[PDB]
Design a protein around this nucleic acid. Structure first.
Ligand SMILES: [Mg+2]
Ligand SMILES: [Mg+2]
Ligand SMILES: [Mg+2]
Ligand SMILES: [Mg+2]
Ligand SMILES: [Mg+2]
Ligand SMILES: [Mg+2]
Ligand SMILES: [Mg+2]
Lengths: 214, 118, 50, 227, 107, 126
RNA sequence: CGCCCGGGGCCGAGGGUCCGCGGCCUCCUCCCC
RNA sequence: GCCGCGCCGCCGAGGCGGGAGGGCCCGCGGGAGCCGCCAGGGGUCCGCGGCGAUGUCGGUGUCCCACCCGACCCG
RNA sequence: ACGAGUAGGAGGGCCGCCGCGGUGGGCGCGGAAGCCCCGGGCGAGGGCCCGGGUGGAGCCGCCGCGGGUGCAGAUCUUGG
């Protein structure tokens, strides 16, 4: 099989080993140094047809080709970041949406960077749904959900809007009770956390976010 | 003497239409309707003219004969092509590319023939 | 006349962005080949001094 | 068929003659850069040894007076004396906040004396020279301000003097060489920004709390805030 | 309430010149420059009411309108901040309320 | 009918350059006249006065003369002046002249619809 | 840039390679499955 | 003050030749070769949400008005 | 790379006006010129195009050509 990169990343864009150190690590001294058409048969003989025939229409004008760039990867291939305060089990605070000011429990970061967020539903009526980390305030309260098993099918396509009235399907309810049945026993170990997740967050007189510790 | 005839018809022609900062030519053998040296349809010994057919369907590829220079009655050879869109373009492409007849106006005549068929 | 002409310079060169070599690594090592070696010896020496 | 394969390898040998030619020039400027990397350190450690020698014997080791100077024009173009306005053109300082290196001699210091209220010069170190040529460094090819992106521009117009890469240009400006005149004149005047953090007083001399005049080693602080 | 109280203290100006494309906000709790760092990048909103009804995202149309902005940098040493809005703030908003949202969050 | 490309047109100034003291007098038309007075404030470009149209306000050459729809205006008077826009119809729209009758405007509109040429005044008189 | 990491603001003008690496071109071992 | 020798001091200003080993290094030994990566000749997404004909959407620069700032009448 | 400007000089104008030779198989009672417009626009500007209304018979683009060719001033002239 293809061996891994024998040059560890010392720094960004810098390899740990030189050209001569990698030559010894790889032992390079042991090394040394169409069909654009298809044929078909018919009932006057055989006809050779051409794949991708010439266009039947040409526009009056055409846009020139763009220049070649680099580093402009699509969104699916982008690097995903996550704040160090957002660890699996932290109680987040939603800022936008209908559930704004409500407190949720962070479970896992999805491949597209969005955070899998749960209420749970049995506490503050917030099901398993995505949530952006930019629109979320992470508190300093963490619950140990290392034993919580999240099913693999909870991907971004699972929470992608199906695009005439929305209705929660039986799969969403089953995946809700599968995760809630594991969070409720460990939430009860932390006293006064059942009502803390029920409560909503809001700024009162004299409370300034630049000096409030979350 | 195309370049000699160009300097006369460069800015003085009954076909030149100068307005809205644009210059268009109304000569019959112009493919882009553009008043330029290359696309001017009366200046060169080899001109390509893609006109609509006399009826509502088909195009007319007008070529300028080699010996038909100072005799306008027998100077242009018209080619009526009434086929499907893909085959009509293949005919115009072969008239220009295979004959080495104004290869610079090859795609200019294909885009004009495509607009006439609409 | 064609025998007397030069090669037609059909290559169009445009203005370059001039990325900062002090901040961009690949630009620095394009002007200074030893810059990658000095950067590597400086990081490894810092880890050795720690 | 035989002519095609023959004319094909002639194109391949043309490309092979270029890639090998690049690796040779890159290997040369690699060894020049590592030699400068070692020379820049030795020059400093030599003076430390000689200074420790004199202090050990109770004597004094007077270092050599600086040969290089970076001159920044601080005043504008309104109301300038004709003699002062002529010297500022000979230093290529035709606008406010621009810098050019000057090879210090008696014919140059007296020119810097005739324009002290309009300039703020000193003795730049190696970091100051490298940052100016890397970030603010531009080239004068045909009186055209060309940015320094590749070593081909330097080797084309300074190759006959032994300057092939940017490190050769920095080594010629910092350590004044035999080709400092052509190397410095090949660099476009550094269009510097306003001093981040503000000045002290632009109309007075640096000794009396201002900014004009000659700040011997304090010009580096001014470069960090303007570069 | 999910936004911080701020006051439109005026535009970025000198003494005889005014740059209306930049606004000076005064946050109710920020009275020092070392405290403005938390608000760098927060969404700003000038919510007001008009006569004609306008469409509301995620709701029914009403008279409420808004001009969105964002805190860009600090201003001075007394906790003032600068904000740039998609449309320059109208001069009638001087001394009125500006909602400083808690997003984009960095906590 | 959509143009070939509809870029974001940037206009450095939308207001009109009014003539100095064009409001205080009905005899002074709004058409711009460069003030040449020896003590004129606008000529000496004092702060707070009317601005002087100079080069620098010129729009981008790529988006100059482009209508808000993306096309460029071109005045036509008959069928022949319309058929020259057959090609490059993705970059120029037709505009029927004002002095042509409603009898001939119907023919120019029905012919431009066949040639996929956009008319800025398709239903003018009818 | 002396070495590394991070944050905020502003914008993407143009539109027919150079410079760094890594895997394989050599056989295996361990971790992960 | 020069010149010669000797002693001594000089992070390693240092250079040469060799010797006991220990171990840190090399644009030495890797390129007319295929594949990818990218701090590499100026931006892209092969990411996404809300709103929908009788009251809403965009424009309405040049119709009125309001406020902050600037602003004295031309020749 | 550069960009101030009176007096002044020079160039460009697909700025505008009147008339002429050409030219557009131009335009027009199915409505020309003029005039009005909280109509749509374009140009950095001179200006221009389009729409509506009014009007009732001529009018315009392009290449050249000829000027009695562009007004806020002159205690300007005439009229209101
Ligand atoms: Mg002065
Ligand atoms: Mg003074
Ligand atoms: Mg305008
Ligand atoms: Mg005066
Ligand atoms: Mg006359
Ligand atoms: Mg007169
Ligand atoms: Mg008058």
């Amino acid at each position: 099989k293809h061996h891994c990169s024998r040059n560890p990343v010392l720094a960004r864009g810098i390899g740990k080993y030189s050209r001569s150190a990698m030559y010894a690590r790889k032992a390079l001294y042991k090394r040394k140094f169409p069909k654009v058409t298809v044929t078909k048969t018919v009932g006057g003989g055989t006809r050779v047809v051409k794949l991708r025939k010439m266009p039947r229409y040409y526009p009056t004008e055409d846009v020139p080709r763009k220049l070649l760039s680099h580093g402009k990867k699509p969104f699916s291939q982008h690097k995903r970041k996550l704040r160090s305060s957002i660890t699996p089990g932290t109680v987040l605070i939603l800022l936008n949406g209908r559930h704004r000011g409500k407190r949720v429990v962070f479970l896992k970061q999805l491949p597209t960077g969005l955070l899998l967020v749960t209420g749970p539903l049995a506490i503050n009526r917030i099901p398993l749904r995505r949530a952006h980390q930019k629109f979320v305030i992470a508190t300093s309260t963490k619950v140990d959900i290392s034993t919580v098993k999240i099913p693999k099918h909870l991907t971004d396509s699972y929470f992608k809007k199906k695009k005439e009235k929305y209705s929660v399907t039986q799969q969403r309810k089953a995946d809700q009770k599968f995760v809630d049945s594991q969070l409720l026993p460990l939430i009860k170990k932390e006293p006064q956390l059942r009502g803390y997740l029920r409560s909503a967050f809001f700024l009162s007189n004299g409370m300034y976010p630049h000096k409030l510790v979350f | 003497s195309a370049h000699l005839q160009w300097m006369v018809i460069r800015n003085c022609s009954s076909f030149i239409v100068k307005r809205n900062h644009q210059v268009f030519s109304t000569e019959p053998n112009n493919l882009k309707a553009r008043n330029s040296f290359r696309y001017n349809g009366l200046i060169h010994k080899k001109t390509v003219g893609v006109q609509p057919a006399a009826d509502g369907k088909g195009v007319i590829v007008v070529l300028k004969k080699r010996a038909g220079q100072r005799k306008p009655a027998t100077s242009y050879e018209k080619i009526s092509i009434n086929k499907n869109s893909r085959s009509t373009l293949s005919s115009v492409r072969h008239i220009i590319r295979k004959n080495n007849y104004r290869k610079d106006l090859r795609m200019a005549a294909l885009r004009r023939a495509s607009a006439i068929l609409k | 006349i064609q025998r007397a002409l030069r090669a037609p310079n059909k290559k169009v060169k445009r203005r370059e962005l001039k990325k900062n070599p002090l901040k961009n690594l690949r630009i620095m090592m394009r002007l200074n080949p030893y810059a990658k070696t000095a950067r590597r010896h400086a990081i490894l020496q810092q880890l050795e001094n720690i | 068929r035989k002519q095609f394969a023959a004319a094909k390898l002639k194109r391949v040998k043309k490309i092979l003659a270029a890639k090998k030619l690049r690796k040779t020039k890159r290997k040369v400027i690699f060894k020049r850069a590592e030699s400068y990397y070692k020379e820049y350190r030795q020059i400093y450690r030599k003076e430390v040894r000689l200074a420790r020698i004199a202090r050990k014997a109770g004597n004094f080791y007077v270092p050599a007076e600086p040969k290089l100077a970076f001159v920044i024009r601080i005043r504008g173009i309104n109301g300038v004396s004709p003699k002062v306005r002529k010297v500022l053109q000979l230093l290529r300082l035709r606008q406010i906040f621009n810098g050019t290196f000057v090879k210090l001699n008696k014919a140059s210091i007296n020119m810097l004396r005739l324009a002290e209220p309009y300039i703020a010069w000193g003795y730049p170190n190696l970091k100051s020279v490298r940052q100016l040529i890397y970030k603010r460094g531009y080239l004068k090819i045909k009186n055209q301000r060309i940015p320094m992106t590749d070593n081909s521009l330097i080797e084309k117009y300074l190759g006959k003097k032994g300057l092939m890469c940017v490190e050769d240009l920095i080594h010629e400006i910092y350590t004044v060489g035999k080709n400092f005149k052509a190397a410095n004149n090949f660099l476009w005047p550094f269009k510097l920004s306003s001093p981040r953090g503000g000045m002290n007083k632009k109309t007075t001399h640096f000794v009396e709390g201002g900014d004009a005049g000659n700040r011997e080693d304090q010009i580096n602080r001014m470069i960090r805030r303007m570069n | 309430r999910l936004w911080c109280k701020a006051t439109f203290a005026g535009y970025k100006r000198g003494l005889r010149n005014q740059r209306e494309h930049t606004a000076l906000l005064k946050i109710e709790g920020v009275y020092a420059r070392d405290e403005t760092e938390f608000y760098f990048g927060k969404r700003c909103a000038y919510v007001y009411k008009a006569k004609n009804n306008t469409v509301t995202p995620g709701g029914k149309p009403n008279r409420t309108r808004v001009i969105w902005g964002k805190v860009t940098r600090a201003h001075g040493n007394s906790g003032m901040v600068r904000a740039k809005f998609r449309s320059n703030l109208p001069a009638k908003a001087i001394g009125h309320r500006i909602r400083v949202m808690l997003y984009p969050s960095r906590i | 009918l959509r143009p070939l490309t509809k870029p974001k047109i940037v206009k450095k100034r939308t207001k009109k350059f009014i003539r100095h003291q064009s409001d205080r007098y009905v005899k002074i038309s709004r058409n711009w006249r460069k003030p040449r007075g020896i003590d004129n404030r606008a000529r000496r470009r004092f702060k707070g006065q009317i601005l002087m149209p100079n080069i620098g306000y010129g729009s981008n050459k790529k988006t100059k003369h482009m209508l808000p729809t993306g096309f460029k205006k071109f005045l036509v008077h008959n069928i022949k002046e319309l058929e020259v826009l057959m090609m490059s119809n993705k970059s120029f729209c037709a505009e029927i002249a004002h002095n042509v009758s409603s009898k001939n405007r119907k023919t120019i509109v029905e012919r431009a619809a066949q040639l996929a040429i956009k008319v800025t005044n398709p239903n003018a008189r009818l």
